[PDB]
């Protein structure tokens, strides 16, 4: 008695902390309880904050995600009259793109690609999207696997400020911070192909 | 247009070495790892390796070790394998391929080098 | 390494029939990883399927390819002269990279 919903695109990430909010608005906004489950719907992820998979308020936290984890996750929306089971597709890749080209992003999807306009001060993201609980530390740029330092670029919060945009800024960027969670350090990497248009 | 040229064949006497070269363009040439696959007469592929234009890094199939060295002019968008103390066996064609990122596979291969090992 | 066995080496069949081969793999290897090439004499390999089931740009309908796991299969559905070619499976999952042996398709006219 409770409305399947199966999403159609897959997350993708490395084999490093990673996590997944139960945001599926207007559902998840009025009084209801989140439940997270891996490949089942009978044993719910563990609430345990030492356990490597768990549950972090509305969020299914991995640290760090590894070889094995790739499936069927569902989110349990209860509320008072209602309840839905959202299903997503969560993969993980072991390899990263500086280290080797083999067993690494299998596809090239829209978290992974970002857009600078020519001859305009633009910007690059970092996307880390993690729960309270971890605390992420400043953000260190590379592109074509070495650390970016340049006039025109700048580190402002998330972002990589990028005045004067030219064609040669097209490349492979990487965007690393230091995440802590429970006094323990991890590292998080984000690979971007940046392409230009005028 | 991603294009991969190759230097022509050579004969190279035993125990010598011999570089062949891979000339990229149509993309950024930091922004992508090198492969090369070798073609032995008769017999189908053998992955050698890859190098990464950007940071220099090389990873190479243990069966090459001490055989191949890769490199990269990235002045003249260039990637170069080496082979050293040529033998018998060493007498194939080679290839050189790109693959790019979130793209794992092979999509654009040089035309190939024969290289022959003979006195 | 991971061995890719693939089956058979030859295959003679005349136009219009359905020609498949097989890839058997000694790990599991990702879908995503899993790739065909064509090989006509003198030239260099040509991507034909990646991702398992992704069509080249250029690849006619007629081929198909599926699979998990260890096992792969390339599949033409009504062989045309132009598909007489030595084909081989491929996996980027695991360092060192493999290939098949290649299945040899010969047509018979």
């Known amino acids: 008695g409770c409305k399947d919903i199966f999403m159609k695109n897959e997350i993708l990430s490395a084999s490093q902390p990673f996590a997944f909010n139960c945001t599926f608005p207007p559902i998840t906004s009025g009084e209801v309880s989140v439940t997270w489950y891996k490949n089942s719907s009978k044993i719910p992820v563990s609430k345990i904050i030492q356990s490597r998979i768990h549950q972090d308020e509305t969020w299914i936290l991995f640290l760090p995600m590894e070889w094995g984890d790739s499936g069927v996750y569902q989110c349990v929306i209860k509320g008072r009259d209602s309840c839905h089971r959202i299903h997503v597709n969560l993969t993980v890749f072991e390899k990263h793109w500086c280290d080797t080209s083999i067993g690494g992003l299998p596809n090239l999807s829209d978290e992974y690609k970002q857009i600078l306009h020519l001859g305009k001060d633009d910007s690059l993201t970092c996307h880390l999207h993690f729960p309270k609980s971890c605390v992420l530390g400043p953000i260190k740029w590379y592109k074509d696997c070495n650390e970016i330092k340049g006039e025109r670029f700048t580190v402002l919060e998330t972002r990589l400020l990028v005045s004067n945009v030219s064609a040669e800024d097209r490349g492979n960027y990487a965007c690393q911070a230091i995440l802590t969670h429970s006094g323990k350090q991890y590292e998080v990497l984000n690979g971007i192909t940046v392409s230009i248009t005028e | 247009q991603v294009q991969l040229v190759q230097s022509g064949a050579e004969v190279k006497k035993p125990g010598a070495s011999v570089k062949v070269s891979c000339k990229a363009s149509?993309?950024?040439?930091?922004?992508?790892?090198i492969h090369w696959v070798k073609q032995a007469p008769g017999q189908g592929l053998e992955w050698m390796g890859e190098?990464?234009?950007?940071?220099?890094?090389?990873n190479y199939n243990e069966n090459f070790r001490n055989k191949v060295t890769m490199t990269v002019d990235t002045s003249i968008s260039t990637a170069y394998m080496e082979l050293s103390r040529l033998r018998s066996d060493d007498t194939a064609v080679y290839y050189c391929?790109?693959?790019?990122?979130?793209?794992?596979?092979?999509?654009?291969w040089g035309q190939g080098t024969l290289v022959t090992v003979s006195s | 390494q991971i061995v890719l066995t693939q089956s058979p080496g030859t295959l003679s069949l005349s136009p219009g029939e359905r020609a498949t081969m097989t890839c058997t793999a000694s790990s599991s290897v990702s879908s995503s990883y899993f790739h065909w090439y064509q090989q006509k004499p003198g030239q260099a390999p040509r991507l034909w399927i990646y991702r398992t089931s992704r069509l080249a740009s250029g690849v006619p309908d007629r081929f198909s390819g599926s699979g998990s796991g260890t096992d792969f299969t390339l599949t033409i559905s009504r062989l045309e002269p132009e598909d007489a070619a030595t084909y081989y499976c491929h996996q980027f999952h695991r360092s060192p990279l493999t290939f098949g042996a290649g299945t040899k398709l010969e047509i018979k006219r």
């Open positions: 391929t790109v693959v790019f990122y979130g793209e794992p596979y092979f999509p654009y």
């Open positions: 149509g993309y950024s040439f930091t922004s992508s790892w």
């Open positions: 190098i990464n234009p950007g940071n220099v890094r090389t």
